[PDB]
């Protein structure tokens, strides 16, 4: 086991306000394989200026996915108050074969700050946070969303400049509003931009510290960080699991401008991941300085046959989901 | 809010005999496979020293005559066989959840 | 009972002793050395002859967060300085019931989760 730093000294947790209705929004961004949306580049071979038929793990054509969105939290004047989150922690999904994630999709455009539906602002990219594991159950007061035994946490930190991946037991804390205490509604992470994101000094531990307020980290077997370059470009994240471990994919390190996903880590996680949930984040802004944070989209992977169209430099820029409709199947059979 | 009880208040023991100190918590101090109970030894005019951590682990330099044991709410420190250098006051503390608390302390004297 | 010899790597060195009048306040320091100052919480403990050890509270030097036990939420105020690697405890509204030796100690994180290292204590006396 590994040392992951200090426990929280806080005697209670920040109060968390769940209002699903403010987060129920239809901003559809479905998979378009003709733009190679959500394609994990096939592993073990390279191709160029050619079209192959391939059987791998892909999201299917036209899948709307599940949309998630993070919001600024309550404020009064210049005083951050309760957190503002959707009902994500109780919504435990099934990992199956894994999933890919469309990150920062609506950036640069304008949208709502969620917590105040009339206020609008320029939308900025925000990275998603995940909790994955093999055993789920209830918290003490009946609520779903508690992960047992070792749990894989994927938690961006450093105002979007870092990804932390760690695999430990999550011991719920007992203070007021904590998962093992009174008036528990949901756990969340947060950071406070006034103190945590002043230029030159991004706090690389601000989100972890907030996580550490709801759970004590115990029997941790690893904790990795992955530096992330600050920009506002559309990018894709993927995760799968084999007997060799959990595999993390990103477009960001190889094909930043195209979206092809390449493996950038193998985590030594050998228990089968059967469940995951999205960890709600809330940003402790003051009222005047709220921002809009781009929704992200999570699409499940299935075994599918695709036509993959490799450009000359070797990247996939067009594809066809053979099972999509009759016309696409006609294109597939016409290459055999 | 866990409260620690130590027994006895003081005890005098002959060289080579065994000393047993008990600690009871008002509520289980067990989670995640640990018992969050620690023992400190304190000599006069000095600050406490950590002896045993997480119920039964000896800190480095601490001889094996100290044996810590127990789980949940009831713990005991045994010193066997006692040497002249073991005359101290012994304190238990839990770290299960905040606020942390210590026991009243047990003063050990040697003949 | 002064069991010394040489020095260890990690040290907490509390400030000197104090005698003050009732109603005053006193502010004592704890200067750490030998470890990364902001990854270890500093805890404070009151020791008076007829109560043993009383936990006061603790501070996280990384973001200044604090915790107190109910009996001390008001009496004590915990602060830290990163540059000097120092922790401070200020006690206000002093009565005779506060004459005691006060300790700072470091919580060791993994493993142990114990007070691995203690300062030598600050003696505070409140004479009527
Ligand atoms: C912000 O969050 C980060 C999380 O990312 C926290 O990072 C913690 O921070 C601790 C800093 O105090 C640190 O604990 C120390 O770690 C060293 C071991 O070296 C490490 O170097 C890397 C980090 O830059 C680690 O990632 C390494 O990890 C290993 O395992 C990981 C698995 O994730 C692999 O990535 C890697 O390949 C490798 O397998 C590596 O572990 C320890 O030496 C140190 O131990 C000290 O404990 C006692 C001190 O109080 C002491 O008893 C110990 O014995 C020493 O005695 C003398 C001092 O008395 C020494 O001089 C002797 O040499 C003897 O060793 C020793 O001093 C301690 O555990 C964590 O490692 C680090 N974790 C990670 C993942 O980065 C920050 O704390 C957070 N900051 C704030 C602020 O909250
Ligand atoms: C977040 O999402 C979750 C999951 O989708 C959602 O869970 C729902 O919680 C409510 C209660 O908060 C559950 O309501 C139950 O419904 C059944 C069907 O009638 C009742 O039997 C239950 O009521 C019993 O308990 C009451 C006292 O607690 C009694 O007064 C009552 O008479 C019954 O004895 C209870 O009403 C609901 O089943 C789940 N839904 C699912 C799919 O699990 C949760 O509420 C959401 N949280 C927020 C903040 O939006
Ligand atoms: C939001 O707006 C920003 C800023 O205009 C967009 O970033 C820009 O994205 C384009 C392409 O995605 C980048 O162009 C690239 O230039 C490089 C290096 O000079 C070149 O080698 C490539 O062929 C590529 O065309 C451009 O660098 C980048 N701008 C910045 C400042 O990084 C971003 O894409 C927009 N996001 C959305 C979701 O609309
Ligand atoms: C990850 O990102 C930061 C850069 O912002 C790096 O940490 C900085 O390193 C430079 C010197 O290399 C220092 O001047 C800064 O003070 C560091 N910032 C800190 C410690 O917060 C870090 O080196 C990068 N790591 C890798 C592996 O790329
Ligand atoms: C967390 O890690 C420690 C291993 O260091 C586990 O503690 C062991 O527990 C077994 C039986 O439960 C004992 O036989 C060992 O002596 C313990 N070792 C210690 C305390 O160092 C603990 O069980 C782990 N917890 C979980 C849930 O896996
Ligand atoms: C790519 O392939 C086409 C036909 O398959 C051919 O006409 C063209 O010359 C090729 N380009 C390169 C760079 O090989
Ligand atoms: C699951 O819900 C029941 C309902 O009150 C509760 O008694 C039980 O303890 C919950 N599970 C856990 C692990 O606490
Ligand atoms: C993990 O915990 C779950 C429920 O607490 C249980 O089904 C399982 O036995 C535990 N893991 C192992 C390896 O036993």
Author numbering:
A (entry chain A): 18 to 353
B (entry chain L): 26 to 136
C (entry chain H): -7 to 120
Text of the article:
Middle East respiratory syndrome coronavirus (MERS-CoV), a novel lethal human virus in the family of Coronaviridae, was first identified in Saudi Arabia in June 20121. On coronaviruses, the component primarily targeted by mAbs is the homotrimeric spike (S) glycoprotein of the virion. As a typical class I fusion glycoprotein, the S trimer of highly pathogenic coronaviruses such as MERS-CoV and SARS-CoV, which mediates receptor recognition and membrane fusion during viral entry, undergoes protease cleavage into the S1 and S2 subunits, positional change of the receptor-binding domain (RBD) in the S1 subunit for receptor binding, dissociation of the S1-receptor complex, and finally formation of a six-helix bundle by the S2 subunits. N-linked glycans attached to Asn66, Asn104, Asn125, Asn155, Asn166, Asn222, Asn236, and Asn244 of the NTD are also included in the model. It has been previously shown that the MERS-CoV NTD folds into a galectin-like structure, which can be separated into top, core and bottom subdomains.
The refined model contains residues Tyr18 to Ser353 of MERS-CoV NTD, Glu1 to Ser120 of the VH and Asp26 to Lys136 of the VL. All three CDRs of the heavy chain and the CDR1 and CDR3 of the light chain participate in the binding. The interacting residues from the NTD are Tyr18, Asp20, Pro23, Asp24, Val26, Ser28, Glu188, Ser191, Asn226, Lue234, Arg235, and Asn236. For the light chain, the LCDR1 and LCDR3 residues Tyr59, Tyr61, Arg121, and Asp122 interact with Glu188, Ser191, Arg235, and Asn236 of the NTD, and a salt bridge is formed between Arg121 of LCDR3 and Glu188 of the NTD. The E188A and N222Q mutations reduced by the binding affinity by 148-fold to 3.7 μM and 112-fold to 2.8 μM, respectively.
